Structures are given as C-alpha cells and as structure tokens.
Symmetry: C2
Amino acid sequence: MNKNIDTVREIITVASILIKFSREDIVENRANFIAFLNEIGVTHEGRKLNQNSFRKIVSELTQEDKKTLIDEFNEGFEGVYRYLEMYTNK
Amino acid sequence: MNKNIDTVREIITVASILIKFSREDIVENRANFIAFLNEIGVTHEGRKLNQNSFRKIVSELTQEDKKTLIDEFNEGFEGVYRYLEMYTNK
C-alpha cells in the first residue's frame, strides 16, 4: 500500500463520497480536497496530504495505476478519478 | 490490493467520512454501511459488498492487517476500525 494507486483509489472514493453528499464544493477545490484528506484521516505514509502529495501522486500516476485500480473500480470511478483532475489537475 | 486491509482501510476511512458528516446513522448499521459501500463505489474485486464481504473481511482480518494499515493509519483509525465493529462486529 505504498503506491499512488492506494492514496489514489482512496482519494477518489472519499472525495466522491463528498460529491455524493453534495460536497462537490470540497471536491472542486485543492485546498478543500487536501483538507478533506487531512480531516477524515487518509494518509500514504503515516501522514495525510499537505498539497504536494496528490500533485506527485498524479504526477507519478500512470494509466496502469488506473488499469489496476479500474480492475476493481470498473466504471464506478470514471467521474471521480477524472473529477479530481478537473478540480485539481497537475 | 486483493486483501482485507484494502477493503478495510477503505471501509473504515469512508464510513468515518460518514461519521464526520454526522452520518453515524449510516456508520451505525450494517445495511447502511454496506449500502454506503455499494453507493460511493467501494469494491474488493470489481464488486462492492453485499453483506458477507465485510463479514469475511473482518472474519479473516487479523491484528497484523491492523498493524500494516496502522503503519499509515497511526492513531487516526482507533475510532473507525473499532467503530465498524461495535456497529458491525462478527
């Protein structure tokens, strides 16, 4: 669980929960998204994300990570993994 | 990502988001918790959880899974991994 895929699958799912709870306002901003991750308790090494984490995650996130996480996240992430980008694309 | 630790770390985090959004009502019931997992889009093999998944997860969940997921989830899961139990303990 020391890969982007983990903090990613998690980042997407959670921020999507937000979007599901009519919290697209939190999912639509980097600060809210980052804080969201820092409040519910999502980390990638005993520490949540400050602002760079996700950036490096996605920066080092490949279409294979998408493939492997899609293996389980078939079509239930095409509007969350993509949404995080439109709201926070790096 | 084909272990309990994944569907667990996810189950906890998400249901905790619920609890964070004053949704302890959803986190406090197996049906709501299961549905919650089935609505936001959390799966462990291209399929969410119907009711048995979590049960077998936790049934096959060991203190080591807790250790490894605690490695990242230091003290931010002592009221979520334990909460899922009080609400759904098998």
